[PDB]
CSV table of C-alpha atoms in Angstrom, one decimal:
chain,number,residue,atom,x,y,z
Q,6,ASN,CA,0.0,0.0,0.0
Q,7,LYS,CA,2.5,2.6,1.2
Q,8,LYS,CA,6.2,2.0,2.4
Q,9,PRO,CA,8.7,4.4,4.1
Q,10,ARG,CA,12.5,4.6,3.3
Q,11,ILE,CA,14.5,4.1,6.6
R,56,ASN,CA,18.7,15.2,14.8
R,57,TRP,CA,17.4,18.8,14.2
R,58,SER,CA,14.4,20.4,15.8
R,59,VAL,CA,11.4,21.2,13.6
R,60,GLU,CA,12.1,24.8,14.5
R,61,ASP,CA,15.7,24.7,13.2
R,62,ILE,CA,14.7,23.0,9.9
R,63,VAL,CA,12.3,25.8,9.3
R,64,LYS,CA,14.8,28.6,10.0
R,65,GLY,CA,17.2,27.1,7.4
R,66,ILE,CA,14.8,26.3,4.6
R,67,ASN,CA,13.5,29.9,4.9
R,68,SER,CA,16.9,31.3,4.4
R,69,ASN,CA,18.0,32.6,1.0
R,70,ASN,CA,21.1,30.3,1.0
R,71,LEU,CA,20.8,27.2,-1.2
R,72,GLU,CA,23.3,25.3,0.8
R,73,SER,CA,21.6,26.3,4.1
R,74,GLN,CA,18.5,24.9,2.5
R,75,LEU,CA,20.2,21.7,1.4
R,76,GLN,CA,21.4,21.2,5.0
R,77,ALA,CA,17.9,21.7,6.4
R,78,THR,CA,16.3,19.4,3.8
R,79,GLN,CA,18.8,16.6,4.6
R,80,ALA,CA,18.0,17.1,8.3
R,81,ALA,CA,14.2,16.8,7.6
R,82,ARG,CA,14.9,13.7,5.6
R,83,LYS,CA,16.7,12.1,8.5
R,84,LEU,CA,13.9,12.9,10.9
R,85,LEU,CA,11.3,11.4,8.5
R,86,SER,CA,13.5,8.3,8.1
R,87,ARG,CA,13.6,7.5,11.8
R,88,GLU,CA,11.4,4.6,13.0
R,89,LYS,CA,9.8,6.0,16.2
R,90,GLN,CA,6.8,8.3,15.5
R,91,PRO,CA,8.3,10.2,12.5
R,92,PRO,CA,7.0,13.7,13.2
R,93,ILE,CA,5.1,13.9,10.0
R,94,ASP,CA,2.2,16.0,11.3
R,95,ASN,CA,4.6,18.5,12.8
R,96,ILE,CA,6.5,18.9,9.5
R,97,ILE,CA,3.2,19.6,7.6
R,98,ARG,CA,1.9,22.3,10.0
R,99,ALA,CA,5.2,24.1,9.5
R,100,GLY,CA,4.3,24.6,5.9
R,101,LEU,CA,7.3,22.8,4.4
R,102,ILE,CA,5.7,20.7,1.7
R,103,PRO,CA,5.4,23.5,-0.9
R,104,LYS,CA,9.1,24.2,-0.3
R,105,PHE,CA,10.1,20.5,-0.8
R,106,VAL,CA,8.0,20.4,-4.0
R,107,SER,CA,9.9,23.4,-5.4
R,108,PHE,CA,13.3,21.8,-4.4
R,109,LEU,CA,12.3,18.9,-6.8
R,110,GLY,CA,12.9,21.3,-9.6
R,111,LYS,CA,16.4,22.6,-8.8
R,112,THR,CA,18.3,20.8,-11.5
R,113,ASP,CA,21.6,22.7,-10.8
R,114,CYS,CA,21.5,21.1,-7.2
R,115,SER,CA,20.9,17.4,-7.5
R,116,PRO,CA,21.5,16.9,-3.8
R,117,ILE,CA,18.5,19.0,-2.7
R,118,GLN,CA,16.3,17.1,-5.3
R,119,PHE,CA,17.2,13.8,-3.8
R,120,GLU,CA,16.8,14.9,-0.1
R,121,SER,CA,13.5,16.6,-0.8
R,122,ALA,CA,12.2,13.6,-2.8
R,123,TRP,CA,13.2,11.3,0.1
R,124,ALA,CA,11.5,13.6,2.6
R,125,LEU,CA,8.3,13.8,0.5
R,126,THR,CA,8.4,10.0,-0.1
R,127,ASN,CA,8.0,9.4,3.6
R,128,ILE,CA,5.3,12.0,4.2
R,129,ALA,CA,3.3,10.4,1.4
R,130,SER,CA,3.6,7.0,3.1
R,131,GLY,CA,1.5,7.9,6.1
R,132,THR,CA,-2.2,8.5,6.4
R,133,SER,CA,-4.6,9.4,3.6
R,134,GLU,CA,-4.6,13.0,5.0
R,135,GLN,CA,-0.8,13.1,4.8
R,136,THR,CA,-0.6,11.8,1.3
R,137,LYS,CA,-3.2,14.4,0.4
R,138,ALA,CA,-0.9,17.2,1.6
R,139,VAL,CA,1.9,16.0,-0.7
R,140,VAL,CA,-0.5,16.0,-3.6
R,141,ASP,CA,-2.1,19.3,-2.8
R,142,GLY,CA,1.4,20.8,-2.9
R,143,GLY,CA,1.8,20.0,-6.6
R,144,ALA,CA,4.1,17.1,-6.1
R,145,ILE,CA,2.7,14.9,-8.7
R,146,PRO,CA,3.8,16.7,-11.9
R,147,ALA,CA,7.1,17.4,-10.2
R,148,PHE,CA,7.8,13.7,-9.5
R,149,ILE,CA,6.9,12.7,-13.0
R,150,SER,CA,9.5,15.2,-14.3
R,151,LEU,CA,12.1,13.7,-12.0
R,152,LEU,CA,11.6,10.3,-13.6
R,153,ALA,CA,13.8,11.4,-16.5
R,154,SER,CA,16.6,12.6,-14.2
R,155,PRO,CA,20.1,11.5,-15.3
R,156,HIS,CA,20.8,10.5,-11.7
R,157,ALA,CA,19.4,7.0,-11.1
R,158,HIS,CA,19.0,7.4,-7.3
R,159,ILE,CA,16.8,10.5,-7.9
R,160,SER,CA,14.7,8.8,-10.6
R,161,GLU,CA,14.3,5.8,-8.3
R,162,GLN,CA,13.2,8.1,-5.5
R,163,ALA,CA,10.6,9.6,-7.8
R,164,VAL,CA,9.3,6.1,-8.6
R,165,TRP,CA,9.0,5.3,-4.9
R,166,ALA,CA,7.1,8.6,-4.2
R,167,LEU,CA,4.6,8.0,-7.0
R,168,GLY,CA,4.1,4.5,-5.7
R,169,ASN,CA,3.1,5.9,-2.3
R,170,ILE,CA,0.7,8.4,-3.9
R,171,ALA,CA,-1.0,5.9,-6.2
R,172,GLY,CA,-1.3,3.4,-3.4
R,173,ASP,CA,-3.7,5.7,-1.4
R,174,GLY,CA,-6.7,4.7,-3.5
R,175,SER,CA,-8.5,4.9,-6.8
R,176,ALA,CA,-8.7,8.7,-6.9
R,177,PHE,CA,-5.0,9.4,-6.5
R,178,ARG,CA,-4.1,6.4,-8.6
R,179,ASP,CA,-6.1,7.8,-11.5
R,180,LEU,CA,-4.8,11.3,-10.9
R,181,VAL,CA,-1.2,10.0,-11.2
R,182,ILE,CA,-2.3,8.3,-14.5
R,183,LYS,CA,-3.9,11.5,-15.8
R,184,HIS,CA,-0.7,13.5,-15.1
R,185,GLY,CA,0.9,11.1,-17.5
R,186,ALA,CA,3.1,8.8,-15.3
R,187,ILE,CA,2.8,5.5,-17.2
R,188,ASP,CA,4.8,6.5,-20.3
R,189,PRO,CA,7.9,7.6,-18.5
R,190,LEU,CA,7.7,4.7,-16.0
R,191,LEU,CA,7.6,2.1,-18.8
R,192,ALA,CA,10.4,3.9,-20.6
R,193,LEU,CA,12.7,3.1,-17.6
R,194,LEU,CA,12.1,-0.6,-18.2
R,195,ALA,CA,12.7,-0.6,-22.0
R,196,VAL,CA,16.0,-2.6,-22.1
R,197,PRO,CA,16.8,-5.8,-23.9
R,198,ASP,CA,17.5,-7.5,-20.6
R,199,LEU,CA,16.1,-6.6,-17.3
R,200,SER,CA,19.1,-8.2,-15.5
R,201,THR,CA,21.1,-5.2,-16.6
R,202,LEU,CA,19.1,-3.0,-14.3
R,203,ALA,CA,19.9,-2.5,-10.7
R,204,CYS,CA,18.1,-5.0,-8.4
R,205,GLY,CA,16.6,-2.3,-6.1
R,206,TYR,CA,15.8,0.0,-9.1
R,207,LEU,CA,13.8,-2.9,-10.6
R,208,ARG,CA,12.0,-3.8,-7.4
R,209,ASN,CA,10.7,-0.2,-6.9
R,210,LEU,CA,9.4,0.0,-10.5
R,211,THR,CA,7.6,-3.3,-10.1
R,212,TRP,CA,6.0,-2.3,-6.7
R,213,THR,CA,4.9,1.1,-8.1
R,214,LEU,CA,3.4,-0.5,-11.1
R,215,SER,CA,1.5,-2.9,-8.8
R,216,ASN,CA,-0.2,0.1,-7.0
R,217,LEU,CA,-1.3,1.5,-10.5
R,218,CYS,CA,-3.2,-1.8,-11.0
R,219,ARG,CA,-4.4,-2.2,-7.4
R,220,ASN,CA,-7.5,-0.4,-6.0
R,221,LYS,CA,-11.2,-1.0,-7.1
R,222,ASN,CA,-14.4,1.1,-7.2
R,223,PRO,CA,-13.4,2.0,-9.8
R,224,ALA,CA,-10.7,-0.3,-11.3
R,225,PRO,CA,-7.8,1.4,-13.2
R,226,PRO,CA,-8.7,2.7,-16.7
R,227,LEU,CA,-8.7,0.0,-19.4
R,228,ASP,CA,-6.3,1.9,-21.7
R,229,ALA,CA,-3.9,2.1,-18.8
R,230,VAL,CA,-4.1,-1.6,-18.0
R,231,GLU,CA,-3.6,-2.5,-21.7
R,232,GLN,CA,-0.6,-0.1,-21.8
R,233,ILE,CA,1.0,-1.7,-18.7
R,234,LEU,CA,0.4,-5.4,-19.2
R,235,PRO,CA,3.2,-6.2,-21.8
R,236,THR,CA,5.8,-4.8,-19.4
R,237,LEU,CA,4.0,-6.6,-16.5
R,238,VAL,CA,4.3,-9.9,-18.2
R,239,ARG,CA,8.0,-9.4,-18.8
R,240,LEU,CA,8.5,-8.8,-15.1
R,241,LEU,CA,6.5,-11.9,-14.3
R,242,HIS,CA,9.2,-13.9,-16.0
R,243,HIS,CA,12.1,-12.1,-14.2
R,244,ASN,CA,14.1,-14.2,-11.7
R,245,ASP,CA,14.0,-11.9,-8.7
R,246,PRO,CA,11.7,-13.3,-6.0
R,247,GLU,CA,10.4,-9.8,-5.0
R,248,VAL,CA,9.9,-8.7,-8.6
R,249,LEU,CA,7.9,-11.9,-9.1
R,250,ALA,CA,5.8,-11.5,-5.9
R,251,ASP,CA,4.9,-7.8,-6.6
R,252,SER,CA,4.2,-8.7,-10.3
R,253,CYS,CA,1.9,-11.6,-9.1
R,254,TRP,CA,0.1,-9.1,-6.8
R,255,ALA,CA,-0.4,-6.8,-9.8
R,256,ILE,CA,-1.9,-9.7,-11.8
R,257,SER,CA,-3.9,-10.5,-8.7
R,258,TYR,CA,-5.5,-7.0,-8.7
R,259,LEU,CA,-6.3,-7.0,-12.4
R,260,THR,CA,-8.1,-10.4,-12.2
R,261,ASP,CA,-10.3,-9.2,-9.3
R,262,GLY,CA,-13.4,-8.0,-11.3
R,263,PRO,CA,-15.7,-8.8,-14.2
R,264,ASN,CA,-14.8,-11.4,-16.8
R,265,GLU,CA,-13.7,-8.7,-19.2
R,266,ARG,CA,-10.8,-7.9,-16.9
R,267,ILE,CA,-10.0,-11.6,-16.4
R,268,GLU,CA,-10.0,-12.2,-20.2
R,269,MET,CA,-7.6,-9.4,-20.9
R,270,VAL,CA,-5.1,-11.0,-18.5
R,271,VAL,CA,-5.7,-14.6,-19.8
R,272,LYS,CA,-5.3,-13.5,-23.4
R,273,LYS,CA,-1.7,-12.5,-22.7
R,274,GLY,CA,-1.0,-16.2,-21.9
R,275,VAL,CA,0.3,-15.7,-18.4
R,276,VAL,CA,-1.6,-18.7,-16.9
R,277,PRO,CA,1.2,-21.2,-17.5
R,278,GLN,CA,3.6,-18.9,-15.8
R,279,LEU,CA,1.2,-18.3,-12.9
R,280,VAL,CA,0.9,-22.1,-12.4
R,281,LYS,CA,4.7,-22.4,-12.4
R,282,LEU,CA,4.9,-19.7,-9.7
R,283,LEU,CA,2.0,-21.4,-7.9
R,284,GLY,CA,4.4,-24.3,-7.2
R,285,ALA,CA,7.2,-22.0,-5.9
R,286,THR,CA,9.0,-22.8,-2.7
R,287,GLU,CA,8.8,-19.2,-1.4
R,288,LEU,CA,5.6,-18.3,0.4
R,289,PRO,CA,5.4,-14.6,-0.7
R,290,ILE,CA,5.2,-15.8,-4.4
R,291,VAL,CA,2.7,-18.6,-3.8
R,292,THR,CA,0.3,-16.4,-2.0
R,293,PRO,CA,-0.4,-13.8,-4.8
R,294,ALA,CA,0.0,-16.5,-7.4
R,295,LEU,CA,-2.8,-18.4,-5.8
R,296,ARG,CA,-5.0,-15.3,-5.4
R,297,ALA,CA,-4.6,-14.6,-9.2
R,298,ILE,CA,-5.5,-18.2,-10.0
R,299,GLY,CA,-8.5,-18.1,-7.6
R,300,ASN,CA,-9.7,-14.9,-9.3
R,301,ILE,CA,-9.4,-16.3,-12.8
R,302,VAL,CA,-11.7,-19.3,-11.9
R,303,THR,CA,-14.5,-16.9,-10.8
R,304,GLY,CA,-15.0,-16.2,-14.5
R,305,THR,CA,-16.2,-18.2,-17.4
R,306,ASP,CA,-15.8,-22.0,-17.8
R,307,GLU,CA,-13.4,-21.4,-20.7
R,308,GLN,CA,-11.1,-19.2,-18.5
R,309,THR,CA,-11.3,-21.9,-15.8
R,310,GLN,CA,-10.3,-24.5,-18.3
R,311,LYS,CA,-7.1,-22.6,-19.2
R,312,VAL,CA,-6.1,-22.9,-15.5
R,313,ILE,CA,-6.8,-26.6,-15.7
R,314,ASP,CA,-4.8,-27.0,-18.9
R,315,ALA,CA,-1.8,-25.3,-17.5
R,316,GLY,CA,-1.6,-28.1,-14.9
R,317,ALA,CA,-2.9,-26.1,-11.9
R,318,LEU,CA,-4.7,-29.0,-10.4
R,319,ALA,CA,-1.5,-31.0,-9.9
R,320,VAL,CA,-0.4,-28.4,-7.4
R,321,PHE,CA,-3.4,-28.6,-5.1
R,322,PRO,CA,-2.4,-31.7,-3.2
R,323,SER,CA,0.2,-29.5,-1.6
R,324,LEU,CA,-2.0,-26.4,-1.4
R,325,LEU,CA,-4.8,-28.2,0.3
R,326,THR,CA,-2.4,-29.5,3.0
R,327,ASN,CA,-0.2,-26.4,3.2
R,328,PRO,CA,0.8,-25.6,6.8
R,329,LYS,CA,-0.4,-22.0,6.4
R,330,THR,CA,-4.0,-21.4,7.3
R,331,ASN,CA,-4.4,-18.7,4.6
R,332,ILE,CA,-3.0,-20.8,1.8
R,333,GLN,CA,-5.2,-23.7,2.7
R,334,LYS,CA,-8.3,-21.6,2.8
R,335,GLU,CA,-7.7,-19.8,-0.5
R,336,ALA,CA,-6.8,-23.1,-2.2
R,337,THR,CA,-10.2,-24.6,-1.0
R,338,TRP,CA,-12.0,-21.4,-2.1
R,339,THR,CA,-10.4,-21.9,-5.6
R,340,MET,CA,-11.6,-25.6,-5.5
R,341,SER,CA,-15.1,-24.5,-4.7
R,342,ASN,CA,-15.2,-22.3,-7.8
R,343,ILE,CA,-13.8,-25.2,-9.9
R,344,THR,CA,-16.4,-27.8,-8.8
R,345,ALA,CA,-19.1,-25.1,-9.8
R,346,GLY,CA,-18.0,-25.6,-13.4
R,347,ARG,CA,-18.8,-28.1,-16.1
R,348,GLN,CA,-19.0,-31.9,-15.5
R,349,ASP,CA,-15.8,-32.6,-17.6
R,350,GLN,CA,-14.2,-30.1,-15.1
R,351,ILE,CA,-15.6,-31.8,-12.1
R,352,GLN,CA,-14.3,-35.0,-13.7
R,353,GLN,CA,-10.8,-33.4,-14.0
R,354,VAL,CA,-11.0,-32.7,-10.3
R,355,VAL,CA,-11.7,-36.4,-9.8
R,356,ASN,CA,-8.9,-37.7,-12.0
R,357,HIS,CA,-6.2,-35.6,-10.1
R,358,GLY,CA,-7.3,-37.4,-6.9
R,359,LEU,CA,-8.5,-34.2,-5.1
R,360,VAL,CA,-11.8,-35.5,-3.7
R,361,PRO,CA,-10.0,-37.3,-0.9
R,362,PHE,CA,-8.1,-34.1,-0.2
R,363,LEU,CA,-11.5,-32.2,0.1
R,364,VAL,CA,-12.8,-34.9,2.4
R,365,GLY,CA,-9.6,-34.4,4.5
R,366,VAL,CA,-10.0,-30.6,4.6
R,367,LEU,CA,-13.7,-31.0,5.6
R,368,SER,CA,-12.6,-33.5,8.3
R,369,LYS,CA,-10.1,-31.2,9.9
R,370,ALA,CA,-9.0,-27.6,9.2
R,371,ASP,CA,-9.8,-24.1,10.4
R,372,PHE,CA,-13.5,-23.6,10.5
R,373,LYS,CA,-13.2,-21.0,7.7
R,374,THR,CA,-11.4,-23.4,5.5
R,375,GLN,CA,-14.0,-26.0,6.4
R,376,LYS,CA,-16.8,-23.7,5.2
R,377,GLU,CA,-15.0,-23.2,1.9
R,378,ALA,CA,-14.8,-26.9,1.6
R,379,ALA,CA,-18.5,-27.2,2.4
R,380,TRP,CA,-19.2,-24.9,-0.6
R,381,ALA,CA,-16.9,-27.0,-2.8
R,382,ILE,CA,-19.1,-30.1,-2.0
R,383,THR,CA,-22.4,-28.4,-2.5
R,384,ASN,CA,-21.2,-27.0,-5.9
R,385,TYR,CA,-19.8,-30.5,-6.6
R,386,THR,CA,-23.1,-32.2,-5.8
R,387,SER,CA,-25.3,-29.7,-7.6
R,388,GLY,CA,-23.5,-29.9,-10.9
R,389,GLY,CA,-22.0,-33.4,-11.0
R,390,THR,CA,-23.2,-36.6,-12.6
R,391,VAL,CA,-24.5,-39.5,-10.6
R,392,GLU,CA,-21.2,-41.5,-10.9
R,393,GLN,CA,-19.4,-38.4,-9.5
R,394,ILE,CA,-21.8,-38.0,-6.6
R,395,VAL,CA,-21.5,-41.6,-5.5
R,396,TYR,CA,-17.7,-41.4,-5.8
R,397,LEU,CA,-18.0,-38.5,-3.4
R,398,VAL,CA,-19.7,-40.8,-0.9
R,399,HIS,CA,-17.2,-43.7,-1.4
R,400,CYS,CA,-14.4,-41.2,-0.4
R,401,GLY,CA,-16.2,-40.7,2.9
R,402,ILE,CA,-17.8,-37.3,2.7
R,403,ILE,CA,-20.9,-38.1,4.8
R,404,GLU,CA,-19.3,-38.5,8.2
R,405,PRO,CA,-17.3,-35.2,8.3
R,406,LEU,CA,-20.2,-33.4,6.5
R,407,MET,CA,-22.5,-34.6,9.3
R,408,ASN,CA,-20.1,-33.8,12.1
R,409,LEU,CA,-20.0,-30.2,10.9
R,410,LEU,CA,-23.8,-29.8,11.4
R,411,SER,CA,-22.9,-29.2,15.1
R,412,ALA,CA,-21.3,-25.9,14.1
R,413,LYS,CA,-22.6,-22.6,15.5
R,414,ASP,CA,-23.0,-20.9,12.0
R,415,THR,CA,-26.2,-20.8,10.1
R,416,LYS,CA,-24.8,-20.4,6.6
R,417,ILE,CA,-22.7,-23.6,6.7
R,418,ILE,CA,-25.8,-25.5,7.9
R,419,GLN,CA,-27.8,-24.4,4.8
R,420,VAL,CA,-24.9,-25.3,2.5
R,421,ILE,CA,-24.4,-28.7,4.0
R,422,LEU,CA,-28.1,-29.5,4.1
R,423,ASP,CA,-28.5,-28.5,0.4
R,424,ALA,CA,-25.5,-30.7,-0.4
R,425,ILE,CA,-27.3,-33.6,1.4
R,426,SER,CA,-30.4,-32.9,-0.7
R,427,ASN,CA,-28.4,-33.2,-3.9
R,428,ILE,CA,-26.8,-36.4,-2.6
R,429,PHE,CA,-30.2,-37.9,-1.8
R,430,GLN,CA,-31.5,-36.8,-5.1
R,431,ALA,CA,-28.8,-38.8,-6.8
R,432,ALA,CA,-29.6,-41.7,-4.5
R,433,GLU,CA,-33.2,-41.5,-5.6
R,434,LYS,CA,-31.9,-42.0,-9.2
R,435,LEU,CA,-30.1,-45.2,-8.4
R,436,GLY,CA,-32.9,-46.5,-6.1
R,437,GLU,CA,-30.5,-46.8,-3.1
R,438,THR,CA,-32.0,-44.1,-0.9
R,439,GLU,CA,-32.3,-46.7,1.7
R,440,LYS,CA,-28.6,-47.5,2.1
R,441,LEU,CA,-27.6,-43.9,2.3
R,442,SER,CA,-30.2,-43.3,5.1
R,443,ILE,CA,-28.9,-46.3,7.1
R,444,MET,CA,-25.4,-44.6,6.7
R,445,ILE,CA,-26.4,-41.1,7.9
R,446,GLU,CA,-28.0,-42.9,10.9
R,447,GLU,CA,-25.1,-45.2,11.8
R,448,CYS,CA,-22.7,-42.2,12.1
R,449,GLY,CA,-25.2,-40.1,14.1
R,450,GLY,CA,-26.2,-37.6,11.4
R,451,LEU,CA,-30.0,-38.0,11.7
R,452,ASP,CA,-30.1,-37.0,15.3
R,453,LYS,CA,-28.5,-33.7,14.2
R,454,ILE,CA,-30.8,-33.3,11.2
R,455,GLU,CA,-34.0,-34.0,13.4
R,456,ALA,CA,-32.6,-31.4,16.0
R,457,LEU,CA,-32.2,-28.8,13.2
R,458,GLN,CA,-36.0,-28.8,13.2
R,459,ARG,CA,-35.9,-26.7,16.4
R,460,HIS,CA,-33.7,-23.8,15.1
R,461,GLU,CA,-34.0,-20.1,14.9
R,462,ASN,CA,-33.8,-19.5,11.1
R,463,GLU,CA,-36.8,-20.5,9.0
R,464,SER,CA,-34.9,-21.7,5.9
R,465,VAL,CA,-33.1,-24.2,8.0
R,466,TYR,CA,-36.3,-25.5,9.7
R,467,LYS,CA,-38.0,-26.0,6.3
R,468,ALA,CA,-35.1,-27.8,4.6
R,469,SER,CA,-34.5,-29.9,7.7
R,470,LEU,CA,-38.1,-31.0,8.0
R,471,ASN,CA,-38.4,-31.6,4.3
R,472,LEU,CA,-35.4,-33.9,4.5
R,473,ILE,CA,-36.7,-36.1,7.4
R,474,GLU,CA,-40.1,-36.3,5.8
R,475,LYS,CA,-38.9,-37.4,2.4
R,476,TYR,CA,-36.3,-40.0,3.6
C-alpha cells in the first residue's frame, strides 16, 4: 500500500 | 537530529546550501522509526518548499533529499498523502523520472508508488498526469538483468499500485498499456519482482470477466501455475490469489487454468501448513467444482476428492466452510457417478459432524448438499442404504434437531429432509 524509506 | 524549529529557519533562508542542510535534516527525521514527526512537519508549511526543491536541477543533492522527505510523508495517512498531492508534487515527481541521476529517478518512482497506493482517486490522478509513459520507458531494455536490483523492485512495486484499487478499477487503456511490461516482469528471476508482479496480476483479475479475459489473453496462466508451485511463500500467496480470481469467470477461462496443470499443485495447497494458503486453495476448488462436468471430472482424475474430504474433516472452520461450498457445488453440478464417488471417499461423516457448528450459513450449504446427494440416490434407487449410513454415524439426530432452530430456511429444509427420507 505505502512504504517508508528508513 | 534537528528540531522542527531549526529545519524551518534554514529552509526559509536565501542560501541554497543552508536549505540543502535543512532538507537533509528533515529527511533524517522522517527516516527514523519511532513516530516520525510527519504532522509537525506539515503544520510548519514545508511541503510547498520541498516540492519546489524537486525542480532545482543545478543542485541534484536538494532534489534527492526533498524527494526522500516527500516520499516518507506520502507514506502515512490518507490525510498526509493528500498534503503531498495538494502541494503540486505529482507533476514534479513525473518530471524527475527522467533525471540523469538514477538514485533520484528511483526516489521519484518510490514517491509516486506511495501516492498511487492511497486509493482509486490518486491512482487515476497519477495516471492523468501522464506517469505511465515515463515509467515504462525506464524498463525498455533488452535484458532486465542489466538494471539495478533495487531499481527494478521499486518499479515493479509502483506498477502494482497503479493496477491495485477497485471502485473503480484502473482505466482500461492504462491496463492495456501496462500489461506487456507486467508480463516481462512476471518472468524475471528476482523473488520480490515476481511476488509484486503476481500481486499486480492478482489485482487486475479481481473483477468482471472482461478484466480476467484481458489478462488470460496475454498467456500468463502457464507462468502463474509455475509460480503457484514455488517454494517461497510470498510468491505462492499472490500466485494463488490470481489463480483463484481467474476461476471466478467463465468456464473457458477456468479451463485454461486446468490445462496449465494447476490441479496438480493442489495436493500441496490443500495440505499447506499456512491457514491462509489452505483456505484460498479450498475457495479456488469450490469455484472449480461449480464448473462443467468434464471439469468436475478433471478434479476427480487428479485425486482431489480425498483431499476435500480431508479438509472437511479437519481444518480451520473458515477453510471448512469453503470446503462445504466446494461439496455443494460438486453435488449440484456433478453426474451420478461423480456424486456416489463422493460418498465412497467418505464425505458423509465429516459433513454430518459439521452440522454441530454454530454458524447458520454452513448449515444451509451442508443440508443443500445432502439434498443433492439424496436426489442422486433416488436416481439409483438406493435411498435406503444412504439413510442407514447417515443414521449409523449419528447424522439423523443432528438433522432432526435442526427442526428446532431459529432461522426458518433451516427448519424447512431440515423437516423436508426427514419427511422425504
